[PDB]
Amino acid sequence: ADYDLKFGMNNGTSSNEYKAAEMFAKEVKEKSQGKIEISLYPSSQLGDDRAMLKQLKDGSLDFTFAESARFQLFYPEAAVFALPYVISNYNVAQKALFDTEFGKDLIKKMDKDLGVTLLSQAYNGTRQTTSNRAINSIADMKGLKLRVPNAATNLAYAKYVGASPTPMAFSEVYLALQTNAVDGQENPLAAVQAQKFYEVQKFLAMTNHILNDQLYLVSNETYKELPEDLQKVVKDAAENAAKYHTKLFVDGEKDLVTFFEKQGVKITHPDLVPFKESMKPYYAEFVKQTGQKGESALKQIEAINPHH
Numbered sequence: 001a002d003y004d005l006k007f008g009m010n011n012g013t014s015s016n017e018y019k020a021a022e023m024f025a026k027e028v029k030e031k032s033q034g035k036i037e038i039s040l041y042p043s044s045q046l047g048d049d050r051a052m053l054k055q056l057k058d059g060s061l062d063f064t065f066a067e068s069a070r071f072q073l074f075y076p077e078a079a080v081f082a083l084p085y086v087i088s089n090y091n092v093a094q095k096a097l098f099d100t101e102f103g104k105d106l107i108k109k110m111d112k113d114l115g116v117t118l119l120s121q122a123y124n125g126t127r128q129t130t131s132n133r134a135i136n137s138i139a140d141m142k143g144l145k146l147r148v149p150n151a152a153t154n155l156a157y158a159k160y161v162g163a164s165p166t167p168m169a170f171s172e173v174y175l176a177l178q179t180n181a182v183d184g185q186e187n188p189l190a191a192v193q194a195q196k197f198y199e200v201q202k203f204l205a206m207t208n209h210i211l212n213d214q215l216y217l218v219s220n221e222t223y224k225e226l227p228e229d230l231q232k233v234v235k236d237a238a239e240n241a242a243k244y245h246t247k248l249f250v251d252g253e254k255d256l257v258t259f260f261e262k263q264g265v266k267i268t269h270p271d272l273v274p275f276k277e278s279m280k281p282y283y284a285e286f287v288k289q290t291g292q293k294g295e296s297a298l299k300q301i302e303a304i305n306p307h308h
């Protein structure tokens, strides 16, 4: 095609993310009259999310997914998006990104500093905790060998609840759980399904600890080369895909418990009051490290009413 573009992701072919990217790719191809074809590179084929972001910066990958929180690697105050229990719901995540001074500035910096254009934002689920033993309360977390992604905020969740974190790449998690090299992981229900973690985890606990969004990103190197009518095709497609993406996750969150129970998983509902209280010193560390910019991001987010 005139533009043979590539979209990389960590998720596999059964996932919501892949389904939404498929929808995006199909719309772009049809609405561009065949001038743009987007090929998909799932399962971290091109590297992890960090690697794929760098490929957008340098222009060698055209599209990828990222979370708003992941930009904490560049702007430490952006950790606010994944401080456990701070962001209440997706309503708050949307307004945090698009409707605060902090979020608008973050979008500008992504463009200027990191060479990527934000096309759209989706909901990507609320993270829960699976394990090889029941989590009936915060006590059961003590010493749990809990896989986390390579991200400070997930490491902190594990630390502050009393668990023993093992960072590792998403692609490695299934085997780590199967071999009992680790005792559990934490991810939204959709990923528990897509990656088949339920096959190798007998327990799921509704910790509700971190709210994930997902950003449709394009490389500025690619976006600048598209004539403006094709830019609009891409943008419009990303906005339509993100709405679909959000719907997949919302519907799954109401449907997946009966799926997991049918697959033999036991679901627990630990009291979250001590989970939340355990984070208080982490918040104070965040404010100590990030100073007035973090204080300010936190105040802007905490000001957002969670009710639509």
Ligand SMILES: O=C(O)[C@]1(O)C[C@H](O)[C@@H](O)[C@H]([C@H](O)[C@H](O)CO)O1
Residues within 6 Å of the ligand: 010, 011, 049, 066, 067, 069, 070, 148, 149, 150, 151, 169, 170, 186, 187, 191, 212
């Ligand atoms: O490895 C995981 O469990 C994963 O959920 C995979 C997902 O594709 C990715 O977007 C996130 C992200 O890297 C973290 O949430 C930190 O921002 O991590």
